[PDB]
Assembly symmetry: D2
Homo-oligomer: 243 residues x 4
């Protein structure tokens, strides 16, 4: 399914990013997963073993981006599949939201998509084949109190993706977004009973999503069987929102 | 894979419906495909072989629906996956559109979705597992001059699907729409050389889609890897429209 | 603002339809409001007085539609502004939904839009000016358990409107949808405390909408100041849903 | 009318911003319009006369924002209506897009919306009344080749607006977006004869929009007749895109 393809998955330490990396490996890809520390990069190298490696990447630092891409090109080849998964939250109601909480979210969650996409596009255009998949959020579509920064970044990456899709579609490259709802992570596992119940009440499916479920959606769009899907957002949210 | 799941694909004679039926068989489903005539049903039985059967079905006729589902239950079992693919066009500008052209489109393309979905839901709710997937159209979301009837039906089945999705989500059933752009079939071949050039100019991918590309999307949603996707529309249109 | 214009408002007896009629009159229109009984038509004639009249109209009966339009053409002139407000509900979970509850909703809420729009379009096309505005619902966009019929009709009229908009836009006619959320009516006034509280919890604004608020939106789109809005849905729902 | 309401319109020198400012004055608002230079501010003061004032504002500079709002509070009072109209383009295909062209668009077109909205919200929350309206673009929803930066900002401000809308709705404040299609201004005049023909071919209305048509939409949302509209995008594009 992905035999001979090279994938770059940003933020592949755990959860969604790790499930994406593992799924792509399971279906034949060579995967480079990234973390913000050399130790995180080591842990990624450890689970990937013979099927890829971990590298330290800061998606807000241009020099870090060039270093990582040159390493990949030296050891593996040109990136066929880019999965923009790295992302953070800095929640606050707007009157409490600090300028840094705004700027860091825009930089890490939106400007990252610009930087990484631009860095891989030339080789994909030459090859007349490629996949760019960004992990958005239901919050980008519905909005959410206390997450106006996160919502701005997650909505903004859809506008970005639609525009890039229009630029590259004629050369067999697709550019799409997967938008998760509530996914079980270490964060949600630490919530109280009342807090989890409050989350579940929002989801018609009546459960949290799994990291693997997001990985399944990404792997579908990354495949040869999604060649006619571009500029699309695939919502994976148990019916929490419906558009 | 779909080992031991029973799928009903309406309108499986050719084009998108046939591609869906073949894909579901290849991945382990027992498939019942339908045509509007007994001769068409036999042709379906021929290609399905030991993995399924063709039946004559008119999706506008309640007696036909009832007879077909009883035949399926007697020979195979209860339907696990319903694919509402049957559909027609009756194109005209509104000023020329005949009552029959409106009504036949509503009955064939919209009311069919109600009738078939209702007819399979009880058993899916009992098993706490099910898939309903309806083939929509880009035209349902974009609109198209000369197709106000078709657009009404294809938009209407999205509203229907979101509502049903909300009713059944907590019992492990998903209800989704796959919305193709222009696909090379007997619905499209009838266009002129300049209509085809006009359509191609609207598609960033620079090509018509293939029937197998829609089948790939349907098969993804029908699978256990799409359990957290419900009330969603998956657009497969080469970038012709982006939402 | 509407001096010299003729408006037809279907279902103008009370609530939204009556507020629409009154607002259009207040801004200079001549208004014909419709009801399903001769007595309802009388009550409309009574509030409209010198600024229009009531007529008995059944939006599912073609002969009734021709009769009403011929009366309007004789007494007033050609319809400049059509507001499709007539609509019903027949709520039920899908396994309890009767065929008549499906068919009556499609006929009254969706096929009506086809019939009335077609009946007024020729004169608007000749005049190179016109407005068609249909009252949709938030349910058409979000879906709702127990309203799959209503949701199908309300979503279907958006697809219809987009297609018709594309057909007529070049001749200065716009075709739009106003989609209310929860509006205070006689129905909601009769609800229990717990029932009203359950509704309000869904609405960030924390109140029900007024019939006049929907009328304001319709009057805006009907005006000369909305000439560049077409194929659009204007959601008036206090933030109950956001697209 | 807006008797005794104070409106701030960013970028009111010409085009859409000027039309918005003039419309709000004509309907009784006291208007503060802004330009990036003192010479531009005087030109605004000239046209506003006794009904308002021009001020120099840079929406990327926190000190400029603070100074301007203090000037408004000292002379007029607290802002009741904020119209975020200031915006720029820095067009390029992604492969040629410079870091500056990305960053300046994000700062000017997206982060400005955060900064200005935050700066007026406290007083609106105290009064239990307010309007925030941001000028988006069709490109935010559709995407456009060569405008991935602009699209990211214009999509991003929708996510922002939905989130803020959710925070403030219960206190009688609305937060909405008006999304113009192609409007005859200094942003568009720079296109070639064949670009203009290419744009016109994409607009069913068969014409560019007027600046006053956007002002009409803004004025409707700013009014007391749009109290139940929040978190909404009002598309004013002649049918160029339909959602
Ligand atoms: N419910 C959920 O969890 C949902 C998550 N998402 C999205 O999924 C993605 C994964 O996040 P989440 O699920 O919270 O799980 P994590 O917090 O495990 O994933 C975030 C990853 O991003 C990396 N990262 C953070 N900052 C930077 C930076 N400056 N440069 C490079 N990498 C960075 C982290 O690296 P490190 O490991 O080195 O710290 C980490 O691997 C995000 O984009 C998030 O918005 C979307 C919808 C729902
Ligand atoms: N082709 C395209 O570009 C696109 C197609 N679609 C949708 O995809 C679906 C399949 O389209 P496509 O393969 O192109 O179409 P085809 O016309 O090739 O096939 C239509 C199928 O539906 C069956 N059918 C028609 N009427 C009825 C009825 N009353 N009861 C039961 N079955 C019926 C036909 O049966 P029989 O063989 O007996 O005539 C046939 O098997 C449709 O829903 C269509 O709207 C959507 C977007 C684009
Ligand atoms: N919360 C709400 O109330 C909302 C309502 N809407 C929509 O607003 C519209 C008004 O409905 P509602 O608010 O329930 O108030 P009403 O029930 O007062 O309005 C319905 C109107 O439709 C007329 N009508 C019913 N059947 C027919 C028919 N066959 N032919 C012609 N006219 C008919 C009725 O006529 P008569 O008076 O003669 O009985 C009545 O005037 C509907 O389209 C509804 O879907 C949308 C969103 C929210
Ligand atoms: N024209 C069109 O077709 C469309 C426009 N839009 C949007 O409409 C809005 C106005 O567009 P339009 O009238 O065409 O544009 P113009 O270029 O005519 O005007 C832009 C305005 O924004 C001001 N401005 C620019 N940068 C800054 C800054 N850093 N701080 C404060 N003010 C600034 C300008 O000030 P100065 O005069 O001092 O330079 C000017 O008043 C924009 O947000 C644009 O994206 C959306 C869709 C279509
Ligand atoms: Na989708
Ligand atoms: Na809208």
């Amino acid at each position: 399914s992905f035999e001979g393809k090279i994938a770059l998955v940003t933020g592949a330490s755990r959860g969604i990013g790790r499930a994406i990396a593992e799924t792509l490996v399971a279906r034949g890809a060579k995967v480079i997963g990234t973390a913000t520390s050399e130790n995180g990069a080591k842990n990624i190298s450890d689970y990937l073993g013979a099927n890829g490696k971990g590298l330290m990447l800061n998606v807000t630092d241009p020099a870090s981006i060039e270093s990582v891409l040159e390493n990949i090109r030296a050891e593996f080849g040109e990136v066929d599949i880019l999965v923009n998964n790295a992302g953070i939250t800095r929640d606050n109601l707007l009157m409490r939201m600090k300028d840094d909480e705004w700027n860091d979210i825009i930089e890490t969650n939106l400007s990252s998509v610009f930087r990484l996409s631009k860095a891989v596009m030339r080789a994909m255009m030459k090859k007349r084949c490629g996949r760019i998949i960004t992990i958005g959020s239901v919050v980008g579509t519905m909005g959410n109190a206390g997450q106006a920064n996160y919502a701005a970044a997650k909505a903004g990456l859809i506008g970005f993706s639609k525009s890039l899709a229009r630029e590259v579609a004629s050369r067999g490259i697709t550019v799409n977004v997967v938008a998760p709802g509530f996914i079980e992570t270490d964060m949600t596992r630490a919530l109280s009973d009342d807090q989890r119940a409050g989350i579940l009440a929002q989801v018609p499916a009546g459960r949290l999503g799994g990291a693997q479920e997001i990985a399944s959606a990404v792997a579908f769009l990354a495949s040869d069987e999604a060649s006619y899907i571009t500029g699309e957002t695939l919502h994976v949210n148990g019916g929490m929102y419906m558009v």
